[PDB]
Amino acid sequence: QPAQTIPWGIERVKAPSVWSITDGSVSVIQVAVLDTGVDYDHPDLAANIAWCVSTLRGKVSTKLRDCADQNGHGTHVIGTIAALNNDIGVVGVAPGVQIYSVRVLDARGSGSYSDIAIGIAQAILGPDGVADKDGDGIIAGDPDDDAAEVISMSLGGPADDSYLYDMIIQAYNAGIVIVAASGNEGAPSPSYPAAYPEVIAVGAIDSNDNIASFSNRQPEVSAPGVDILSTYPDDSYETLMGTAMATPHVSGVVALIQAAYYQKYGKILPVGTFDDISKNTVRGILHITADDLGPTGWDADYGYGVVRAALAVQAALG
């Protein structure tokens, strides 16, 4: 194993200064990563993998054989969120956060919408199979339940399907922050599910703070998505680009917000909406503390700007 570095993207989103407050290791907090699966024994990941599930071909399997990453993409996205802060490899935005790895994409990185919807439900239901076990209407943030508080989707399709959207709406109403890649086609607006109002669409910047040419436009926020070193199978590291690499940076920032807020208050913040510019909502916080690049204000390239964890957490706690 190589000695640990902090990838430039982690530095850019101002994560390291948060860690003295929280690394995301607050027990009620989990991030569900819906992707190609995970190298679950990776030395720089293993300790943070709380649950491994697969929804491929419409069957739910919790077997390691079925949940393991056959592509590399899931492992890479998961390390940007949650690679451990230790002496090896890399470090994630929220290096202590628990991960639920939900495999919705196959070996070739392709997925059916049906499997994705079922993946989203797994993040609501959690290992115990029940959304709201004590029936109080609190799901995300309820220490009695085991729902994820973030769903991270580094994937996208061109179709807007009624039933997938119904599932997104269920997660949103469960109090879950949903974050998805804007897409890599240089298109004028985001792919689905990023394009839904309930979901944070994420664009990609490069190390010069330029928007990547492939980044789908009109995102909500943007993050490091070019030359991103992270974990990769088997027990190794790789550098990749795309909106899929930007997404986990934002998911890690939300994890830090909700961890810090629960640590201080014993509750989590509401998800909020695209227009929110208050401090009273996860999305409002993201929007107002984002580094406003390009023309003043929200713009079609960067969205509100590059997320910044340090400032977001301070806005949450103050």
């Binding site: 392709s110 919807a117 439900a121 609501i124 399907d161 039933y163 792919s191 795309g242 909106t243």
Partner: protein, 65 residues
């Protein structure tokens, strides 16, 4: 055989229906009123006419970004 997602009215739909048109149930959603079904490619129109069937949607593809 193709995979399709049916949005249903639970008051008028029964999962045992789909056998009637040569299909079978893949997955019943707990959290939304929908069921994933494999049907013969040529029976989609027939499925749209089955009791309690509100919408039939093809199974679309997402890709890693």
């Amino acid at each position: 055989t193709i995979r399709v997602i049916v949005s249903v009215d639970k008051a008028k739909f029964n999962p045992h229906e789909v056998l009637g048109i040569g299909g079978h149930i893949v997955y019943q959603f707990k959290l939304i009123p929908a069921v994933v079904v494999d049907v013969p490619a040529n029976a989609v129109g027939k499925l749209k006419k089955m009791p309690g069937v509100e919408k039939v949607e093809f199974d679309h593809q997402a890709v890693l970004l």
